[PDB]
Amino acid sequence: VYQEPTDPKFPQQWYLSGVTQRDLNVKAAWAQGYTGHGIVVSILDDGIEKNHPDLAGNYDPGASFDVNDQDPDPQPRYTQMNDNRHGTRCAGEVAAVANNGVCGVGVAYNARIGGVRMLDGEVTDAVEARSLGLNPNHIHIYSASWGPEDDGKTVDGPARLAEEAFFRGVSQGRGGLGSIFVWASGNGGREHDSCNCDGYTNSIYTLSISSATQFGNVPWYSEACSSTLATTYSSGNQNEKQIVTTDLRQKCTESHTGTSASAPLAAGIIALTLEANKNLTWRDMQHLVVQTSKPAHLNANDWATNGVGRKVSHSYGYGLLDAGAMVALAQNWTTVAPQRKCIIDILTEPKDIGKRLEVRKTVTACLGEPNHITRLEHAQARLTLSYNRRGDLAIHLVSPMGTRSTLLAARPHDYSADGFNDWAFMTTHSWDEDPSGEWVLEIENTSEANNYGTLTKFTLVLYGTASGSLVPR
Template identity: 55%
Template sequence: MVISLKLLIVVFLLFGCVIANEEPSKDWLNDTDYIDSTHTVIRLKEKDDELAHQIAKRYGMVVKGEPFMENHYFFYHEQPDHAYRRKRTTSEQLGEHPAVEWVEEQRPKKRSKRDYIHIDDVQEKKTGEDLIGATKQTIHHMARRKSTLEVPQLPWIDPLYKNQWYLTGGADGGFDMNVREAWLMGYAGRNVTVSILDDGIQRDHPDLIANYDPMASSDINDHDDDPTPRNNGDNKHGTRCAGEVAAVAGNNQCGVGIAYKANIGGVRMLDGAVFDSVEAAALSLNQNHIDIYSASWGPEDDGQTFDGPGPLAREAFHRGIKSGRNGKGNIFVWASGNGGSRQDSCSADGYTTSIYTLSISSATSDNREPWYLEECPSSIATTYSSAAMSQPAVVTVDVPTGCTMSHTGTSASAPLAAGIIALALEANSKLTWRDVQHLVVRTANPKPLLSTAGWSTNGVGRKVSSKFGYGLMDGAALVKMAKTWKKAPEQNLCIYEYKLNRPNPRPVSGRFRMNFTIEVTGCQIGTPVLYLEHVQVLSTIQYGRRGDLKLTLISPAGTRSILLPPRPFDYNSNGFQKWPFLSVQQWGEDPRGTWVLIVESVTDNPKLKGTIEDWSLLLYGTAEPAQSGDPSHNAAPQSSVEYAVSGLTAQDRIPPYRRAAQGESTQNGMSPMKFLAICVYLILLLVLAA
């Protein structure tokens, strides 16, 4: 009887091991959410809605919502409680259909909104008496936009405008986002469309309805056109972000949006399980109509996660910058993250390390770093937010009506940046996605924030910080420069691959420090990069405790960027695979000379082991100055960093986007093979004991 019981335990453990390695993790989703939302995405060879429905019906599935990225379709099982193995079999059968070019069963992804503090009792609620009348207005009113610039009479009559300290010189030293000067020049975001990718938007809010744009809105969670959030207490985030951008000015409601005449829309995508397909559908929504996408969310800011966009979302980004806005490229604004208390780094977030996003950090009213701020060299600039209950936060609209004075986190910073960029796009609608990044780098003001440690000066004399990027965004300076800006030359990409000498991969253990150097002289084929914009390092490292690793990149001009600081809460033993670390701190520098990548471990455990593999240096930029008045890099530079050159291979072929530009996300925790091995070991012990 004892032996039979132990054998039963063995069978149970073996079954559990198999299931654990095959089933997606659901520890953060309840079973109902997962079952109702799991789905398959197919890509047809060409868009054909009727054919998609026929294929779905053939396999006991239905198509929901509209196709995204032209020919991608959401397929759901008619009976959502199908077993996982049956769903996988169906996916395999779909892949064999001659009209299906690609198929993938979607797995849920953990995504978090980046607002930290909810002080909902500090609010001024409006009665909403104007709501019924406001709903009779024309919802999409671009035709009534005036071409002449109307100069506002300040201050605004909106009751909470006086509390918008970040617009009215209320930060220490009298600083703010300097948008009043832009307003007095007549700019308010006219004919610019912003979409908030979040948990929905209260489209009939009296302070939003006049600017609401249905063509910039969608409900991807429920696959319909109504982005209104569920009023359950959790879905205020998107509406609040929308109010920061485009709350109507001068209507005696709440406060004022920075781009108070912009078209504002919202995508409901975070009010349910999030998938790669959901993100892609949001990021690719009406890319020729929407100018700016604002996202205040990302992977968990827990100090232990490495994650980023999946293949579909990466493709949506790529399509956006290549063909969005009729070829000028969409602008993607991203909140840098709220994991500061966990010593997290935005370098572990694949959305903020994309060259296609503007990663926006936060500063408090006393011009200091908030406690939740994450450091990384991919942050390009900063806007205001708050940190403590004693400090003023951001004023905006609330759900379903009324206002709040307590919006905060980097969630509040990204929409302010989106609103400021909307002012610049009104001033110059021809700006490309790269033009916008150039303008932000060149007009950000570091002076208000210089009292916080961590600033350095890069090779072209710009102050830069891993906390604040190039400084506080300046609305008036951005608009003024936008008006005279000439389109930047095409962006080139030069790739250098570092090939390790034997042993390769290189074994490491305990506390170590290794320097790897690459000599950059230009591309073998094509036009070289002489004026840097983005710099990426694609690296693969396995180590017993990933959080003990530190990566530092030094440019020929001596600019030192900490690509990855130690993260004490990251116990992962898998490391990262071709992760795209990004730095914008070398913007404008000449890349020729010696680059140094320092890989080190700060561990106190001599038993930790790992391996370092070949790595790549990706240099994005131009062969000519971005503007005619920029300093010229003609003479061959003298490298300020002297190290021996080792293992250098120049590569002139640009790799596929999906491999080079974004890399692959790294899962956390134990690998499936390691977990299975432990299971087998436990089973053997039980068998021997039996």
């Protein structure tokens, strides 16, 4: 019989287990025997307190480096304001030591944990690339609780070196099975930001994770978009509990908050899943998340059922992660077929946007060719357009099975006249659908102003396979 941890703050970790069903079902995975042994996770942030009494026993120097100062020791820089506490708080969520009389426990409390010190300085393209590409045959899972500014007017993503690091990681990392990249979807809720305008979360190579409050609501800081995959608990209002973890100066905190706390919990659950089947590819892991995540009792006004019967929301993706279900399904999982890519250039001529523009196109999805796709994974609409006030635009894409993805919602603070330059808006909401048939793109002006512009390119890019499907939910 499994004995649950005895750490002094474990009873306050409401999100790991309980009788109330408002949890991530992590104790069920522990009782199946999975605690993270043999898995390596690295936190890409402002450093890690490698001598913390709740981290030292799991610390891994092979998973660590200091990119800011060009040395191997990722110890954070100590200041009166404790500004460099952020990475230590994230690490304890993943792999804080269990049954040692100190603070609480990590989701994967027997995993090995490291940190890359890379945010305490100017964060260039080269700095990102060196961190994402660190020791890729030793580190299994990378966790990133940072990104472009959440001011609600930025459009930005990885530059050339960083994008090259993503492709090298999923292609050759982890013995050719592919590095696992976990991303926090963002804190821009108060600015009405869209996480499709962030190239890191919007990438197909990252699992982008959103947040829910203890009572099951959309937190004030949450950003909605179609590229989010799933959700873990984090903070909310002052009557709702928060996240318990290791803090700077060898302390314990019960007040870790925001999008920053959601990605590390997902990284820990993925660590338990890899222990249950070390042969899973980067794409296998996203399939497992899609099939096992749970919508129930998360409140949102946009829940919709897609073409294969799964509920999906722009605030939550496919719902809350379920650790017990993840490790169970992983054990006898059959590896997916190699990934196919079908490129469809839609437009024959430019189109004026004006007040509203609708573009309809029936596709065969590369029928008769080696890259024929009958079973979709990610889909992208790569758009080039000019417009006089970018934040007045709303953009939607409808799949042949009738699933309406919001690619872009209105952004009141985005006054840019720069438009979009081949920006690859991504949706997860049509996963496992057949993409043959009519696709519909809608672009509209959400304001009463007399705005003007032109759509000059629309490439529909489909990813997936032609085998292995399941009876729709």
